[PDB]
């Protein structure tokens, strides 16, 4: 689909068993979700944007249909305010900025 | 053009005076800007971002040349790690996401 930002681009994501609304950002280099109930083993990292730097859990090799497209990336999980799909998943599914 | 997501997205600007370089970002609803001198009077607010929020001061109808498109809107000038261009600046120049 075409997206004009007129409103936030809002996509729905089933990510573990649930469904999730989630940001398709292109100034996020990484793909960081709220807290929820993921598999496996992670490593610790930190991330910063604007205010500064988080604590996150990052997943390898988590599968991701987004907007129903399938797509496996790092997902990092931690205390962000809504979900964010970035630049790592968004080439998997194709996304181009078009001016 | 059309920007595919495999590098950030960074367009060059000319905001009063100066050249920049800045990320198109679809998941920023504002135009936030590293410390400028910029004419005027400014007003202080508050954003939220994904480590915390931010004091900046705002600036209105300040005209930007984003890749040649002259738009024109808000302003925010703070400390922001890189310049953004926002939701509210991408829709008049006709910026879409597609995939
Ligand atoms: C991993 C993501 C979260 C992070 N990117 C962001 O936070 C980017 C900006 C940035 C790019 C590069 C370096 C620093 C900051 C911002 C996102 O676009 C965020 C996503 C978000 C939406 C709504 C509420 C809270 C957050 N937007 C945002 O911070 O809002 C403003 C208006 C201040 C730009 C990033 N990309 C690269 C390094 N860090």
Redesign the pocket.
């Known amino acids: 689909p075409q997206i004009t930002l007129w409103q ?1 681009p809002l996509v729905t994501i089933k990510i573990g068993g649930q469904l999730k609304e989630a ?1 398709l ?8 979700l709220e807290e929820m109930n993921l598999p496996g083993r992670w490593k610790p990292k930190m ?5 500064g730097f ?1 604590k996150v859990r990052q997943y390898d090799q988590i599968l991701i249909e987004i907007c129903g497209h399938k797509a496996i990336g790092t997902v ?1 999980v931690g205390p ?3 979900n ?1 799909i ?2 790592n998943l968004l080439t998997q599914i194709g996304c181009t900025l078009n001016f």
């Open positions: 936030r940001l950002d292109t100034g996020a280099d990484d793909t960081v991330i910063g944007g604007i205010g988080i990092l962000t305010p809504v964010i970035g630049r």
